[PDB]
Design a protein around this ligand. Structure first.
Ligand SMILES: OC[C@H]1O[C@H](O[C@H]2[C@H](O)[C@@H](O)[C@@H](O)O[C@@H]2CO)[C@H](O)[C@@H](O)[C@@H]1O
Lengths: 380, 251
């Protein structure tokens, strides 16, 4: 198919229908971005030509299509009522002259299984263009990606709606961490068989669009560091120079934090600990708060907090257990300030404390914790 | 959907893609080996509207998670997945397997007594809800992995004579009971290996002859008992001779 506005459109019942080795192309992409889809689902209101459009419960199988010169390679909407109609594309050969493109998979209220074949791209707009755009996909939906990512860097995903649905199923990421971008990390539901050791942050020169797992391309905010470390099994976080701040309660992954950067909790916010393990701050320029408790623990699993940097909770506590906790805190050298090292909101939390530094609130050596904490060991 | 008949131990019946929109019963079978594999299967709303059928036949699950497993001894159905609150399962037989497969963080016990009559593994997660746990016929709950087992606000946990928790892992085990605990003349915890255990009793009440014991020479243990309703006669000797204490916190 050689087309001008839309290549092929599939609507309503098409059960078991197949489109194999289709070769669909706009005749060049000049002014392609200005075409207006004629037959399209209500949720697709973007301007640009569309090679393949599917909606109203249609689930045609696309096997090895070749799509060329399109603004939108695929626009697909699940059935309005129940999200019925799986978007199925196996090994699409997507190309466009001058890297001109809006999105490859514009998915609305739907699920999908796509297998990439190491061919593809994202457009020239550094903010809006992305391989996937997930529009209002429901909580129960999954948009699964297998295969090889394109060789050149691309922005993987953007979306609208309250639920993540993208799944990286053993996706061969190639060099995407280094040269590509995730786009919006919020839309990734889970990741299987894809790992990275470190997550890099730079509060001034980082870019949130980046994956963050390659040192040359760090992210900027702390908002999603727990999620990212969980998805990619990161062992450490590297904080480049500068103050990494939060203004809302934010979870910290239980990993080793390093680098010359510092951590700051503002607007009375607290850093959150929601999983067991060990959180280590090693050599940072410090961690402090403008008045909120430093670490709020909400897990009953064994929590170890290892701070080998300057720590200042002010008149607040370094650690506050919101459950019946089991915590071990160790301050190594540098300095520590707080009214109590550990406290709890209620019914007894057990803890072990080691504070090895002369710069500490000496006056609480005899009463280092509040009434709701019972000590297993005290080394000061 | 599937019926697996006498598939050998080495076999794998892998399922990928998206499950049907409408609820279905996934698997049933015959034979002593699980072979079904959920490989990033898009389950949709199957947990809420469908059924697993026979959980025994599921060998492994990749990329499919659920936060909570729901148990209802009164209204539950074992055909259910149990991972959705409107469709709880009814027995405890497979809660350890189910939680391990779907990476559940907690177990919810609906009102009523959830009982076992043969030794049964408990996943190391948070248990909550109005239900109670009962080990009958001399059986014990089994702790086979490291981590933390927490009983929070249940109507209670007790046994008709067997030890309450039998630990068979050398990994660090934390047992947190914030509910009524009654092991009778038996122990709350029995280590069958050279264990490393931390037991935390919070309020409510506790009864047992020893809080922790072991089948053989030495098992390190840390204990905190914060409740006035405890057998004070063992404050001075809370554990058997095969357990050495790392710390002891009792008033
Ligand atoms: O629910 C069916 C379908 O109805 C509307 O689709 C329109 C479409 O938008 C037009 O481009 C044209 O093809 O007519 C269709 C109906 O006759 C909704 O816009 C669409 O979302 C919905 O699935």
């Amino acid at each position: 198919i050689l087309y001008k506005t839309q290549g092929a459109v599939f609507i309503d019942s098409n059960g078991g229908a197949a489109v194999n080795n289709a070769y669909i192309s706009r005749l060049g992409n000049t002014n392609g971005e200005l075409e207006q889809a004629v037959y399209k689902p209500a949720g697709f209101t973007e301007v640009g030509d569309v090679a393949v459009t599917q909606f109203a419960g249609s689930e045609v199988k696309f096997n090895s299509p070749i799509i060329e010169q399109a603004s939108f390679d695929f626009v697909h909407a699940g059935r309005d009522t129940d999200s019925y109609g799986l978007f199925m594309v196996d090994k699409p050969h997507i190309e466009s002259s001058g890297g001109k493109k809006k999105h490859s998979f514009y998915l609305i209220n739907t699920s999908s299984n796509v297998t990439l074949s190491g061919v593809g791209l994202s457009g020239q707009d550094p903010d809006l263009d992305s391989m996937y755009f997930l529009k209002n996909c429901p909580e129960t939906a999954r948009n699964v990606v297998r295969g090889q990512m394109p060789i050149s860097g691309v922005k993987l995903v953007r979306g609208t709606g309250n639920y993540p649905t993208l799944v990286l199923d053993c996706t061969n990421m190639g060099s995407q961490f280094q040269f590509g971008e995730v786009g919006d990390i919020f839309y990734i539901k889970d990741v299987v068989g894809v790992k990275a050791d470190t997550l890099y942050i730079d509060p001034v020169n980082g870019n949130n669009y980046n994956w963050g797992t390659n040192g040359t391309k760090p992210i900027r905010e702390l908002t999603n560091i727990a999620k990212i470390c969980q998805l990619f099994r990161c062992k450490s976080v590297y904080l480049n120079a500068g103050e990494s701040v939060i203004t809302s309660n934010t979870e910290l992954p239980m990993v080793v934090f390093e680098g010359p950067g510092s951590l700051k909790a503002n607007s009375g916010s607290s850093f959150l600990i929601k999983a067991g393990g060990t959180l280590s701050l090693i050599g940072l320029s410090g961690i402090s708060t403008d008045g909120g408790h430093m670490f709020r623990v909400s897990t009953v699993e064994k929590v170890n907090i290892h701070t080998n940097c300057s720590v200042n909770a002010g008149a607040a506590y370094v650690v506050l257990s919101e459950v019946q906790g089991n915590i071990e805190y160790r301050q190594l050298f540098y300095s520590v300030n707080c009214s109590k090292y550990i406290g709890a909101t209620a019914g007894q939390t057990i803890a072990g404390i080691m504070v090895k530094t002369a710069t500490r609130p000496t006056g609480i050596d005899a009463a280092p914790v509040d009434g709701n904490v019972s000590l297993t060991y005290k080394i000061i | 959907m599937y019926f697996l008949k006498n598939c050998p131990e080495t076999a794998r019946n892998v399922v990928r893609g998206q499950m049907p929109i409408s609820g279905v019963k996934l698997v049933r079978g015959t034979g002593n080996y699980p072979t079904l594999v959920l490989d990033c299967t898009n389950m949709g709303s199957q947990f809420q509207f469908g059924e697993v059928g026979d959980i025994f036949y599921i060998k492994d699950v990749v990329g499919v998670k659920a936060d909570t497993l729901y148990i209802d001894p009164v209204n539950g159905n074992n055909y259910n997945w149990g991972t959705n609150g409107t469709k709880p399962i009814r027995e405890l037989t497979n809660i350890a397997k189910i939680c391990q497969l779907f990476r559940c963080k907690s177990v919810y016990l609906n009102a009523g007594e959830s009982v076992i009559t043969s030794n049964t593994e408990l996943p190391m997660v948070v248990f909550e809800g109005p239900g109670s746990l009962k080990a009958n016929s001399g059986s014990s709950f089994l702790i086979k992995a490291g981590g933390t087992l927490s009983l929070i606000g249940l109507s209670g946990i007790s046994t008709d004579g067997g030890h309450m928790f039998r630990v068979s892992t050398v990994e660090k085990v934390n047992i947190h009971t914030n509910c009524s605990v009654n092991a009778g003349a038996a122990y709350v915890v029995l280590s069958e290996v050279q264990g490393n255990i931390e037991y935390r009793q919070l309020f409510y009440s506790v009864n047992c002859s020893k809080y922790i014991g072991a089948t053989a020479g030495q098992t390190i243990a840390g204990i905190m008992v914060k409740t006035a309703t405890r057998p004070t006669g063992i404050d001075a000797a809370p554990v058997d001779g095969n357990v050495s204490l790392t710390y002891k916190i009792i008033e």
